């Protein structure tokens, strides 16, 4: 079964640090623990669903799952007042549950629950003493709200993230590939504090609907709160080059959200365009897209329909 | 004493007071204003430390409650050693400061780790970090950090904590060498943003070494409280003491900052013509004119410094 759980765990993962460690981890200790941390956000979008889906894969593969609602991190990264963040954190927990991470499959933890404890703060000070400002600053390049002229709070942020792995008893740290430098810092520094180096699983960074970097500004992304009509509109005008698989926003939704959740995707089409076709794997879909057998217009309609089913169900649970 | 005498005593030998207006108001409105000086525990206590110790004595004489913060966590963040090593040095420093005159009967001692790891304090550190730019924090540590470039993250946290010590210790007047000015300005601007009062700051000058240059452990151009009498005499005899020149003259500075304030007067033996100086102005005037020769001044300075250190070592045990 090791082989099949390894396949599921690494599905749609961009990188695993390291493969061997992950394998031996599944071997020794039949109770592996993985987590993902999230700065509470008023808007939960496909990007979040990227790592959420990976947590569901892991839970299906036998892992214990922890979801860290990193409220202190959100504060340090200028996401608002403690009060505002506390409210978004509760909202986020509801959504994650509604998306499938129910409290019987995952344990939700609030950073403030332990990040102000004496043992944790002392570790932060030790981490700060052995970490150069340079290394810390560089680890935050793709994470900090401020790339240039950051606040001291953003330099403390990576140290705390690394410590969250140790204090939550995590064996596998899951996160987007933009968390890579922070995870390497953890692997290098945690042992110096008497903690084990974590295995890391990185997911790819989803490009926005326009084919460029996803940005809260442009709004080139889909939120779990977007109504069916809005989802349809955004997909309709999304960048989707015919025969181009990589960096294709629509293909990405099929690959990362629909197929993993539904198993297959039916693309209804008029007879003159080929008639209804069903894809049991992404490689089959991509192959037809690459060859021109599957046209962007038909794929878009199907992706919008499945995504809407996904979100509708989410809202249903969300009550 | 009246307000005038208190202000003269407090500002005596200060390089800067931020601000004198705030200081007068503090004294006129608060019954027991509080002042402090923080020190990273150090293996060697020297005349530089005795400079701020004397200022705390002046403040206490003026009615202030004085606190000595043994900043153990700060020493750790500024790479002074393991917690174990720093703890031992902190204990030693406390005994030395008590021996020098800041006895537990007249000053309160606080160890940083007693409160710097508490929830309320740590939360304030996060709040301070949130409103302080890395650039300002780094710049404030220019003359404080052990690492000029390539500093550790611990050294960027350091100034935030020093600023917060002022609020958490209930301090009204922060005392420190002029090299602490940037951290103090950070405190004056950001503490109010966290809902705390802006402290009055009093800065003492940086004491030049015995060769007239920057004190350095490499040179040994300074007097340590542990130096035996003959070593103090040897170091003073050999010290930079430019004839007729007063500014940053190491020997005249010892008379100015340590002897006159403490003994109230300084007797200099001279052949027939012993002279008693009651003010540094009188002493300096005679030095500039040539009426007071460097050799005679050196012998007197060594004598008084040895009385001070000998007494301290006796109290130390
Ligand atoms: N750094 C993560 C959030 C996070 C915070 C703390 C952690 O322990 C883990 C993850 C992000 O940018 O999404
Ligand atoms: N920064 C001071 C030490 C200090 C530490 C903490 C304080 O609150 C005050 C002072 C020095 O360099 O000597």
From Swiss-Prot, chain B:
It is an enzyme of class 6 (ligase). A motif ('HIGH' region) lies at residues 41-49. GO terms for cellular component: cytoplasm. Its EC number is 6.1.1.1. The keyword Protein biosynthesis applies. L-tyrosine binds at residues 36, 158, 162, 165, 180. It catalyses: tRNA(Tyr) + L-tyrosine + ATP = L-tyrosyl-tRNA(Tyr) + AMP + diphosphate + H(+). GO terms for molecular function: ATP binding; tyrosine-tRNA ligase activity. Keywords: Aminoacyl-tRNA synthetase, ATP-binding, Cytoplasm, Ligase, Nucleotide-binding, Protein biosynthesis. Its main location: cytoplasm. The keyword Aminoacyl-tRNA synthetase applies. A motif ('KMSKS' region) lies at residues 214-218. It is found in: Cytoplasm. Pfam families: tRNA-synt_1b. ATP binds at residue 217. InterPro entries: aa-tRNA-synth_I_CS, aa-tRNA-synth_Ic, Rossmann-like_a/b/a_fold, Tyr-tRNA-ligase, Tyr-tRNA-ligase_3, Tyr-tRNA-ligase_arc/euk-type, Tyr-tRNA_synthase. One of its GO terms (biological process) is tyrosyl-tRNA aminoacylation. Catalyzes the attachment of tyrosine to tRNA(Tyr) in a two-step reaction: tyrosine is first activated by ATP to form Tyr-AMP and then transferred to the acceptor end of tRNA(Tyr). Belongs to the class-I aminoacyl-tRNA synthetase family. TyrS type 3 subfamily. Homodimer. This is Tyrosine--tRNA ligase.
């Amino acid at each position: 079964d090791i082989t099949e759980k390894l396949r599921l765990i690494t599905r749609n993962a961009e990188e695993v640090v390291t493969e061997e460690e992950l394998r031996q981890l599944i071997e020794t200790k039949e109770k592996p623990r993985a987590y993902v941390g999230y700065e509470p956000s008023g808007e939960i979008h496909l990007g979040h669903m990227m790592t959420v889906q990976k947590l569901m894969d892991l839970q299906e593969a036998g892992f214990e799952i922890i979801v860290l609602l990193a409220d202190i991190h959100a504060y340090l990264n200028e996401k608002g007042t403690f009060e505002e963040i506390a409210e978004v954190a509760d909202y986020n927990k509801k959504v994650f549950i509604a998306l499938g991470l129910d409290e019987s499959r995952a344990k939700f933890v609030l950073g403030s629950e332990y990040q102000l404890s004496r043992d944790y703060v002392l570790d932060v000070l030790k981490m700060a003493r052995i970490t150069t400002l340079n290394r810390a600053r560089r680890s935050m390049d793709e994470v900090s709200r401020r790339k240039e002229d950051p606040m001291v709070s953003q330099m403390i942020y990576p140290l705390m993230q690394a410590l969250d792995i140790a204090h939550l008893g995590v064996d596998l740290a899951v996160g987007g590939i933009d968390q890579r430098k922070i995870h390497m810092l953890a692997r290098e520094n945690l042992p110096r504090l008497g903690y084990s180096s974590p295995v890391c699983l990185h997911t790819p960074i989803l490009v926005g609907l326009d084919g460029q970097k996803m940005s809260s500004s442009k709004g080139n992304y889909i939120s779990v709160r977007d109504p069916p009509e809005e989802v349809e509109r955004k997909i309709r005008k999304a960048y989707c080059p015919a025969g181009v698989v990589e960096e294709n926003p629509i293909l990405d939704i099929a690959k990362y959200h629909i197929l993993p959740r539904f198993g297959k995707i039916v693309v209804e089409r008029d007879a003159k365009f080929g008639g209804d076709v069903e894809y049991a794997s992404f490689e089959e879909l991509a192959e037809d897209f690459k060859s021109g057998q599957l046209h962007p217009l038909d794929l878009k309609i199907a992706v919008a329909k499945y995504l809407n089913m996904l979100l509708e169900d989410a809202r249903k649970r969300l009550g």
